[PDB]
Nucleic acid binder design. Sequence first.
DNA 1: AGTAACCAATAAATGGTATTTAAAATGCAAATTATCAGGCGTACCCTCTTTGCGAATTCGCGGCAGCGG
DNA 2: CCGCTGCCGCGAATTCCGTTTCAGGGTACGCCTGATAATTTGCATTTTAAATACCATTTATTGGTTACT
Length: 48
Amino acid sequence: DMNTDYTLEEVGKQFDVTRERIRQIEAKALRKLRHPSRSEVLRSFLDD
DNA sequence: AGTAACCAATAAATGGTATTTAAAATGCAAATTATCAGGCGTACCCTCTTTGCGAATTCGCGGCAGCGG
DNA sequence: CCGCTGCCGCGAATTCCGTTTCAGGGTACGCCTGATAATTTGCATTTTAAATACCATTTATTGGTTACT
């Protein structure tokens, strides 16, 4: 939704300096969206 | 051959807030080889000559042209 | 001296369908040189067996005894 992607370092220095914390945030987000309830519609974009 | 839920207690039940760890891996921009792409030159003598052959027997119509009182 | 010939332009139904994606020019050669396009290393960011440093509310063990087949 935004023009460019900001790398891990920029996100860390903006929100919370910790680098591995961003890694844990992404891990938890992936874990949540892998929960079968939320992903149901996205499966329809399965073949691509 | 054995009743309790009394009131403390014990840490285990979690899933959540982070500065670390350095190793790895992953990308990144150099050096350093191959090969490709241009330029030049050639000294017996040689001199209009090749074409199109016909976007191919249309036809009907129009009009802008040269000759002419 | 304002008439007619002769040039050159311009135009000619509608949809589908089909099909061979296809061939034909007849002229040289060997140097230097720069000019890219290949190929070779290191450094940024992930991701790191995990290791690590605090908050957290919810069972677990629990403190066992007073009644009693």
